[PDB]
Enzyme design. Structure first.
Site, PDB file in Angstrom:
ATOM      1  N   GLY A  42       0.822  -1.201   0.000  1.00 25.82           N
ATOM      2  CA  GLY A  42       0.000   0.000   0.000  1.00 25.82           C
ATOM      3  C   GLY A  42       0.854   1.248   0.000  1.00 25.82           C
ATOM      4  N   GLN A  47       3.624   9.540   2.589  1.00 28.19           N
ATOM      5  CA  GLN A  47       4.738   8.607   2.487  1.00 28.19           C
ATOM      6  C   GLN A  47       5.694   8.910   1.334  1.00 28.19           C
ATOM      7  OE1 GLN A  47       2.348   4.813   3.784  1.00 28.19           O
ATOM      8  NE2 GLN A  47       4.524   4.269   3.617  1.00 28.19           N
ATOM      9  N   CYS A  91       5.778  -1.442   6.724  1.00 22.50           N
ATOM     10  CA  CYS A  91       5.596  -0.082   6.287  1.00 22.50           C
ATOM     11  C   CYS A  91       6.799   0.308   5.485  1.00 22.50           C
ATOM     12  CB  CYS A  91       5.468   0.856   7.492  1.00 22.50           C
ATOM     13  SG  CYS A  91       4.842   2.510   7.091  1.00 22.50           S
ATOM     14  N   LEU A  92       6.565   0.961   4.361  1.00 22.70           N
ATOM     15  CA  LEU A  92       7.660   1.339   3.494  1.00 22.70           C
ATOM     16  C   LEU A  92       8.491   2.468   4.088  1.00 22.70           C
ATOM     17  CD1 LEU A  92       7.628  -0.656   1.623  1.00 22.70           C
ATOM     18  CD2 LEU A  92       6.240   0.745   0.026  1.00 22.70           C
ATOM     19  N   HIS A 133      -4.142   0.998   7.792  1.00 21.33           N
ATOM     20  CA  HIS A 133      -2.744   1.354   7.869  1.00 21.33           C
ATOM     21  C   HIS A 133      -2.574   2.701   7.195  1.00 21.33           C
ATOM     22  CE1 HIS A 133       1.575   0.299   8.341  1.00 21.33           C
ATOM     23  NE2 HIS A 133       1.695   1.167   7.352  1.00 21.33           N
ATOM     24  N   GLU A 134      -2.927   2.774   5.915  1.00 26.86           N
ATOM     25  CA  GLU A 134      -2.770   4.018   5.174  1.00 26.86           C
ATOM     26  C   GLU A 134      -3.609   5.178   5.722  1.00 26.86           C
ATOM     27  OE1 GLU A 134      -0.372   3.541   3.170  1.00 26.86           O
ATOM     28  OE2 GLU A 134      -0.422   1.335   3.048  1.00 26.86           O
ATOM     29  N   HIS A 137      -1.780   6.882   8.454  1.00 29.82           N
ATOM     30  CA  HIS A 137      -0.792   7.780   7.894  1.00 29.82           C
ATOM     31  C   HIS A 137      -1.353   9.200   7.704  1.00 29.82           C
ATOM     32  CE1 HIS A 137       2.943   5.586   7.236  1.00 29.82           C
ATOM     33  NE2 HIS A 137       2.236   4.521   6.909  1.00 29.82           N
TER      34      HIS A 137
HETATM   35 CO   LIG Z   1       2.815   2.597   6.210  1.00 26.73          CO
END
Ligand SMILES: [Co+2]
Length: 178
Positions: A42, A47, A91-92, A133-134, A137
């Site tokens: 995602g 991000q 998570c990236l 998750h997103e 953010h």
């Molecule tokens: Co993330």
């Protein structure tokens, strides 16, 4: 440019999109680009250094594909199931950092599409997982806020590791080591 913890942008409240134009399609385009190229499932707009409320994903980026892509502008969670579960989340923005997080299984959401039009949908299972998750953010929440006490600890070294690296930004002075 994919950002990383603890850039302080990751902690700012993202702003609502207002112009649903072509520019936007490209921003979203580039968003998917980074994503596919960073082996990530995602991705949200902060991000990649954009304080705007955009979320995108793909359940099967193993094989990047049109309309297998999901996009959500200005989302809102309007109800969640009471049934929760813990799954391993990554998570990236935290490379090589992984842990279990507790989240509701199903979510009722509202959002707006690439064109401006509102939408009501129920997400469950993986889609539910990726969504929250997103979405976190966008509010300045990171999955290490919701991590179990056990996994939070089991991962301090790494987290601290990442704060070092990042301090090697205004590090032309040696008082930041490796
Ligand atoms: Co993330």
């Amino acid at each position: 440019k994919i950002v990383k913890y603890p850039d302080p942008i990751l902690r700012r409240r993202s702003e609502e999109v207002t112009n649903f134009d072509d520019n936007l399609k490209r921003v979203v385009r580039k968003m998917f680009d980074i994503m596919y190229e960073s082996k990530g499932i995602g991705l949200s707009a902060p991000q990649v250094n954009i304080s705007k409320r955009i979320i995108v994903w793909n359940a099967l980026y193993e094989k990047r594909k049109e309309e297998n892509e999901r996009i959500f502008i200005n989302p809102s969670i309007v109800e969640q199931s009471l049934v929760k579960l813990k799954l391993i989340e990554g998570c990236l923005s935290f490379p090589g950092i992984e842990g279990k997080v507790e989240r509701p299984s199903i979510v009722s959401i509202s959002y707006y599409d690439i064109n401006g039009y509102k939408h009501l949908k129920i997400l469950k299972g993986i889609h539910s997982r990726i969504f929250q998750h997103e979405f976190d953010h966008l509010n300045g929440t990171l999955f290490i806020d919701k991590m179990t006490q056990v996994d939070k600890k089991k991962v301090r070294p790494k987290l601290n590791e990442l704060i070092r690296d990042y301090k090697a930004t205004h590090s032309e002075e040696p008082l930041e080591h490796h």
